[PDB]
Structures are given as C-alpha cells and as structure tokens.
C-alpha cells in the first residue's frame, strides 16, 4: 500500500479529475472496483497502443486479490513507467565520446563556481569507476545522479 502514497502525490489538479471519468469507464456500482477488460480499450483511450505481446502481458502482471478490478489506488502506479544523453554531448564535446581531466577542467572552469586544479583532479576520481582518465556515458549517468 506504500506505493499508493507517492502515487497520490504525483497526482495534481489538472490530472486527478481527468484520470477519473475514464478510469471509471472501468467500474459500476458504488462499492469500489474498476475493471481491466477494457484495460487496453482505455490505454489507447489516452494515446497508448500496446501491442498484444504488450496486451497479454498487461493482463498477466496486474491484479492479484481476485477483486478483478483496479481502483485509483494501485492504478496511477501503472501510469508513470509507461536529457542525460544531451549533457553528455555538451560535455563530451570533441566527439571522442569521452570526457577527461581537462575538459572537465574546462567545464568546471567554464562555469561560475570557484574551483581549483585541486577541485578538478578530485572529481575525476569518483565517476570513472573502472579507473582510466575519462567517463563512459555509463559513468556519465551515475555521477550526474541526484543533480537536477
């Protein structure tokens, strides 16, 4: 039931009164339900064409109590999972797909916050896991994590 919490935070006014009237086109009698045999007739009903190997599965993973329904609870959960490649380009810069000590030196010197030839050779020691002198995109999404 923990999912339902964050789940309701995500919902803001212009899409709580909307994810309603149609989600309902799944229920039928004040008492809590909602169905799913119109799980595909409504997905697309919002612009989602799930192939049938992506229509038999959306039927094989959901619902486990027998209620044969799906409310606005464990609902908008199946409605979140269905630029970090950009920055790599504005940082990688030079096309060698990599980013070494200097460019970073640059960028870390191409910004407005004070740093040093000491603030640089310390950062390079945290994203380049494999240990080398660059940062594969792989290690480009790990350091840059948590940051805006």
């Amino acid at each position: 039931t923990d999912q339902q919490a964050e789940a309701r935070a995500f919902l803001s006014e212009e899409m709580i009164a909307e994810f309603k009237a149609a989600f309902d086109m799944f229920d039928a009698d004040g008492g809590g339900d909602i169905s799913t045999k119109e799980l595909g007739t409504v997905m697309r009903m919002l612009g989602q064409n799930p192939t049938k190997e992506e229509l038999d599965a959306i039927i094989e993973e959901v619902d486990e109590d027998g209620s044969g329904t799906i409310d606005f609870e464990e609902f908008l959960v199946m409605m979140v999972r269905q630029e970090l490649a950009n920055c790599f380009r504005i940082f990688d810069k030079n096309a060698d797909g990599f980013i070494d000590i200097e460019e970073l030196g640059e960028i870390l010197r191409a910004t407005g916050e004070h740093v040093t030839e000491e603030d640089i050779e310390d950062l390079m020691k945290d994203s380049d896991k494999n240990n080398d002198g660059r940062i594969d995109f792989d290690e480009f999404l790990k350091m840059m994590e948590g940051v805006q």
């Binding site: 380009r89 096309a95 797909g97 990599f98 494999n130 594969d136 995109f137 792989d138």
Partner: protein, 85 residues
Amino acid sequence: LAKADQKRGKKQTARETKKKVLAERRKPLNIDHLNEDKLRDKAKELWDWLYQLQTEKYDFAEQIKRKKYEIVTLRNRIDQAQKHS
C-alpha cells in the same frame, strides 16, 4: 560468385525500388500553352513544394551527424563494456 548475386542482386534491387518511389511525387509537367498569370501563384507552388523537398533534406541530414555521434558513444559504450572478467 557470391559477390555477384549478393552485392549484384541487392543494389539493382535498390535501383527500381529507388527509381519507383520517384515517378509519383513527380507530377508530369503538363500545363503547356493555356493562359498567362497562372504560373504566378503556381511557380511558387511548384516552388512551395520545391522548397519542401529540399527543406525535408537538411533535416534528413543533420539528424545524421547526431546519430553518427550517438553511434560512437554507443560503439565506445560497447568497447567500454567488454572486459572478459
């Protein structure tokens, strides 16, 4: 001989498939000798299309310097993922 039925029966297979999707967006220049100020709006119409044809291009292009890149990155993201260990 496998270099004369593979590379030979594929590029030629590309030609017709090439020349074909061409004699259709290619509206025969029919209008010959009729009235005078049609060409006006018209010239810029065949043109307006003309413009298009071309315009779709650069797009078609530059989108390639992006992936010729996205490519590398990947390629390397592939040569950075080997390690037999």
